[PDB]
Design a protein around this ligand. Structure first.
Ligand code: POV
Ligand code: POV
Ligand code: POV
Ligand code: POV
Ligand code: POV
Ligand SMILES: *[C@@H]1O[C@H](CO)[C@@H](O[C@@H]2O[C@H](CO)[C@@H](O)[C@H](O)[C@H]2NC(C)=O)[C@H](O)[C@H]1NC(C)=O
Ligand code: 2J9
Ligand code: 2J9
Ligand code: 2J9
Ligand code: KAI
Ligand code: NAG
Lengths: 117, 253, 50, 51, 51
């Protein structure tokens, strides 16, 4: 509520019916008729929609993020897949020179597909 | 199949074939996966990879079904893939079994009306009575403000909702969307001869029958002593079960 | 053997490992569709167990 | 219920107050006062324990 | 990621770094995880460690 004000039964300035309704509205209020008439007209189809039920099979909006942290885990694993190719040539650096000519051998022998040695 | 959406059942199949082709490419490419299982001669050059494409598919299926397979990655580049597929298939299996609890026990079915005041609020379901009855006469004389709302709906459309008989009131419940207001002794007979109708509320009031006589008739005493003789003997329960019989419906679910 | 095959079925039923795993893809489809069976039976069991 | 019977306001045989209460009990019933008075006295601590 | 509070997701990550570290530390000075490889192996005085 921004402010608070209320419904007055208007009378002209000087009406004797002012006090006779002022007492009367208090008489309907202390008895409870002003709450009976409000809960008969401000009643109706009370909104069901808010509650729950019965449903919400998990979709892409629900689970969602393990298709992202999976793909971030496989992209990171390819980055450490080339990192073990570079360090294997660095452990092959005490044999040929340090580099490509020893590295192109390992590039080939993986691609022969179970020619193992 | 219900607790996951039908695209999520495909996105798991496209991830079980997706990871298991990536795990084959990394294992074939990584040099640390190649091992020699020859304890006799360790330099006999019997280096070997277990991850063929039929074995890489089986790690993905084996970890997804939570039984686990005999295959374990031992190169680190395949061990992040084997470690992130164990987390994906930890969340899928847990989200399935935590949604499957919801799709087994929820309710039978809730009815949109459960009483008389819920029937007064819902102005979608139209409702009436016989237009020559004491069911109409009760709601017209009532002032209890639940039935003032129900008569104001019926008195507005006395051509529409109010009917001429009990038979024309049941046919408009069976065909239309309607909430006909009977008396409780002919709801018990209808809900045995026709197992697709029900009694929604309890009882709105309490009434009872009686052999009517003219004003000041001498028989109003000789009948009401003879009715009490038929009720102490148990005749009025023998004649009710004989006619309001037990034709048979399913229980309540 | 028939003793070892029945200990795969009982082993995969109670969600525990067994020392034998199917090779030979025609026996991996049996061992893969008995894994999806026992996943759904136990997930349906412990869902109503409360 | 084993049988069914009800509460009658007794009168001596030949009382003119018989019909004047017979109409009157129907008047409290059609208005709803016999359901107000029953649900005020047969109300109380409704048993929680079952739930 | 909601059914555990974001300090629990950290405390189970500092437990994986804590238990697996102390599993390594104990496996250094536990003189029964110095098993015999090569399952035949007439002794040859060479033992190793899985951890
Ligand atoms: C268990 C043992 C310990 C494991 C250690 C690692 C655990 C600690 C990890 C993470 C700690 C989390 C701290 C929060 C900081 C980042 C979060 C964030 O910003 O989210 C952002 C990105 O986030 C992502 O998308 C995923 C990023 C991480 C996934 C890969 C983890 C590597 C695990 C494997 C290697 C493990 C390393 C060790 C081995 C090499 C959100 O951005 P978005 O999602 O893209 O957009 C929203 C989506 N939307 C658009 C639809 C709305
Ligand atoms: C953001 C990244 C982007 C990409 C950057 C590039 C990637 C950079 C990352 C890695 C570099 C790649 C090359 C590394 C060398 C491989 C050899 C090896 O693993 O050692 C040995 C493992 O046993 C150990 O002793 C491991 C020591 C601890 C390292 C792992 C920490 C685990 C924590 C987890 C947290 C993550 C750890 C993070 C890294 C520490 C095995 O060696 P071997 O060859 O088997 O020889 C043994 C002899 N044998 C064969 C007879 C048995
Ligand atoms: C090389 C290996 C690659 C992986 C291969 C693995 C094989 C299989 C992999 C995946 C198979 C399944 C595909 C995943 C996504 C499916 C969801 C979808 O398409 O629909 C969604 C799109 O989703 C988005 O728009 C989110 C953006 C993330 C895209 C991927 C980021 C990963 C890399 C970044 C991290 C790099 C970090 C690097 C490391 C730190 C729909 O959008 P929504 O908003 O979610 O819907 C809301 C619904 N609503 C509107 C009704 C409310
Ligand atoms: C969380 C655990 C993840 C597990 C992995 C996920 C696997 C994907 C699983 C299922 C994905 C496909 C179904 C999509 C779901 C939508 C519903 C649907 O389409 O059903 C359609 C029917 O079709 C079927 O129900 C049969 C689907 C295949 C059965 C699963 C095989 C598992 C293989 C194991 C893989 C390893 C084995 C190795 C190789 C063999 C029709 O709809 P309906 O509603 O059914 O109505 C008709 C029924 N009615 C008769 C009542 C009228
Ligand atoms: C060691 C080797 C390396 C290990 C590395 C890896 C290990 C990683 C280990 C730990 C990682 C981080 C730990 C997180 C803290 C958890 C506690 C907590 O949160 O609860 C509460 C802290 O209040 C307390 O309960 C304090 C009690 C201390 C008693 C002694 C603790 C040591 C037990 C060991 C005994 C040794 C002797 C036994 C010999 C057999 C939070 O307070 P609150 O939110 O207000 O809640 C109300 C609490 N209330 C109801 C109780 C009031
Ligand atoms: C099943 O539901 C349907 C629709 O919800 C109902 O049957 C029909 O309901 C409409 C009301 O919109 C009537 O006009 C039709 O005449 C009804 N069909 C028949 C064949 O009478 C009803 O709730 C249920 N139908 C059943 C159980 O047969
Ligand atoms: O407009 S009023 O007569 N005077 C102001 N107020 C109270 C100050 C809130 C109220 C509060 C409730 C009313 F119904 C009326 C009035
Ligand atoms: O209409 S009646 O004569 N009086 C009202 N009542 C009881 C008050 C419920 C009943 C209850 C059962 C009847 F058979 C008759 C009547
Ligand atoms: O004793 S009565 O006057 N006559 C018998 N009955 C009906 C037969 C049940 C009833 C039912 C309800 C009553 F309140 C009274 C009577
Ligand atoms: C069948 C009809 C119209 C009769 C039966 N008893 C009430 C009576 O005789 O007053 C009416 C029921 C009703 O109005 O629903
Ligand atoms: C209820 O209606 C349905 C279809 O309208 C039909 O089976 C039958 O008339 C009723 N059902 C039963 C079980 O009698």
């Amino acid at each position: 509520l921004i402010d608070s004000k209320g419904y007055g039964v208007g009378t002209p300035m000087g009406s004797p019916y002012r006090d006779k309704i002022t007492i009367a509205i208090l008489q309907l209020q202390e008895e409870g008729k002003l709450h009976m008439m409000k809960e008969k007209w401000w009643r109706g189809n009370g909104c069901p929609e808010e509650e729950s039920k019965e449903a919400s099979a998990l979709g892409v909006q629900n689970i969602g993020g393990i298709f992202i942290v999976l793909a971030a885990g496989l992209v990171l694993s390819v980055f450490v897949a080339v990192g073990e190719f570079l360090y294997k040539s660095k452990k092959n650096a005490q044999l040929e020179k340090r580099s490509f000519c020893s590295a192109m051998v390992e590039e080939l022998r993986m691609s022969l597909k179970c020619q193992r040695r | 199949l219900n607790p996951l959406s039908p695209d999520i059942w495909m996105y798991v199949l496209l991830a079980c074939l997706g990871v298991s082709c990536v795990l084959f490419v990394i294992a074939r490419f990584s040099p640390y996966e190649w091992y020699n299982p020859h304890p006799c001669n360790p330099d006999s050059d019997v280096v070997e990879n277990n991850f063929t494409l039929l074995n890489s598919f089986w790690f993905g299926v084996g970890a997804l079904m939570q039984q686990g397979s005999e295959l374990m990655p031992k190169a680190l580049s395949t061990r992040i893939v084997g470690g992130i597929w164990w987390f994906f298939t930890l969340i899928i299996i847990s989200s399935y079994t935590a949604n499957l609890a919801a799709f087994l026990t929820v309710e039978r079915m809730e009815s949109p009306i459960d009483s008389a005041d819920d029937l007064a609020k819902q102005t979608k379901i139209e409702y009436g009575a016989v237009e020559d009855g004491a069911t109409m006469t009760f709601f017209k004389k009532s002032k209890i403000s639940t039935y003032d709302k129900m008569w104001a709906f019926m008195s507005s459309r006395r051509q529409s909702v109010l009917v001429k008989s009990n038979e024309e009131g049941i046919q408009r419940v069976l065909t239309s969307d309607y909430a006909f207001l009977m008396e409780s002794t002919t709801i018990e007979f209808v809900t045995q001869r026709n197992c697709n109708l029900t009694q929604i509320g309890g009882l709105i009031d309490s009434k009872g029958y009686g052999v009517g006589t003219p004003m000041g008739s001498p028989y109003r005493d000789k009948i009401t002593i003879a009715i009490l003789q038929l009720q102490e003997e148990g005749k009025l329960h023998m004649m009710k079960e004989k006619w309001w019989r037990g034709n048979g419906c399913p229980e309540e679910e």
